[PDB]
Amino acid sequence: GRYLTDFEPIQCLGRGGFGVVFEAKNKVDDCNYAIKRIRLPNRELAREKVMREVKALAKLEHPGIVRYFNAWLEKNKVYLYIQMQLCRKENLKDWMNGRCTIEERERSVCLHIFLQIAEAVEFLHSKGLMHRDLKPSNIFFTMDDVVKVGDFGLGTKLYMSPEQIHGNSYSHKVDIFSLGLILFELLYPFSTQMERVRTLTDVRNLKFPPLFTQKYPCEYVMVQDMLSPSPMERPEAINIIENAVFED
Numbered sequence: 679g680r681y682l683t684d685f686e687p688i689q690c691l692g693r694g695g696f697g698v699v700f701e702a703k704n705k706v707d708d709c710n711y712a713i714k715r716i717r718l719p720n721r722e723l724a725r726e727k728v729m730r731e732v733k734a735l736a737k738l739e740h741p742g743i744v745r746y747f748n749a750w751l752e753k754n755k756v757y758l759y760i761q762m763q764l765c766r767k768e769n770l771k772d773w774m775n776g777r778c779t780i781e782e783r784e785r786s787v788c789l790h791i792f793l794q795i796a797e798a799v800e801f802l803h804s805k806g807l808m809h810r811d812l813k814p815s816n817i818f819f820t821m822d823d824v825v826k827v828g829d830f831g832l833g834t835k836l837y838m839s840p841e842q843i844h845g846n847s848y849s850h851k852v853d854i855f856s857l858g859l860i861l862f863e864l865l866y867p868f869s870t871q872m873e874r875v876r877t878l879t880d881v882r883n884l885k886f887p888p889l890f891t892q893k894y895p896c897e898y899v900m901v902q903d904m905l906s907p908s909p910m911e912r913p914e915a916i917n918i919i920e921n922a923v924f925e926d
């Protein structure tokens with residue numbers, strides 16, 4: 679089909695239960711792209727849902743949202759292709775892994791990163807959309823270093839709000855919970871992978887390393903709020919963006 683004819687596959691970038699993402703070079707324009715292939719549901723109503731979802735996402739233009747290029751269908755069982763700007767190999771998880779000391783995690787740089795994520799989320803919320811899948815392995819950097827919120831719309835539960843885990847009804851407030859943990863994680867580097875999971879699961883339960891609360895008193899209170907078991911109590915993305923910790 680169009681994919682094999684117009685593109686040269688380079689490598690596989692990711693494989694969820696949803697679909698697959700490939701790096702592919704367009705033969706005509708010579709640029710490399712990230713192309714997600716999704717198996718389309720056989721049922722009529724489920725297909726219409728997905729096709730409306732595509733039409734909503736295609737309208738999205740924001741500094742913190744990956745640039746969209748094209749979407750199309752191909753028959754084998756039908757597949758939906760979505761062609762997006764190719765971000766860097768190193769995602770936010772990799773970024774944090776390569777910087778394991780306090781000196782390597784400068785306050786300003788970390789907050790500038792978090793702010794861009796938070797602004798992308800605020801933009802989606804204001805449109806009536808939620809992200810649902812905010813985690814460091816799904817947060818990207820463009821070639822020119824702009825932070826991008828990852829794949830969404832159509833893995834660990836470590837960043838997933840309690841209500842979202844339990845299959846309970848939920849709102850945009852789920853993204854705020856995810857934001858809290860990411861803010862903590864940006865400011866608190868880890869020696870080992872096991873320390874990371876040990877500490878993060880505690881932070882989910884509102885139990886904080888005493889060195890974090892003393893070094894980051896303001897953002898501690900903020901993270902505490904964003905991590906309420908009760909979604910109503912979590913602040914709006916706009917409130918977080920306008921918080922005093924992002925003054926300068």
Ligand SMILES: Nc1nccc2scc(-c3ccc4c(c3)CCN4C(=O)Cc3ccccc3)c12
Nearest residue numbers: 691712714735736744746763764765828829830
């Ligand atoms: N863009 C990417 N660059 C490098 C590696 C990877 S791994 C996954 C992606 C990626 C990122 C974002 C998105 C996708 C793959 C598919 C759809 N999409 C979105 O952000 C959703 C969206 C679709 C259409 C318009 C706006 C947003 C990736």
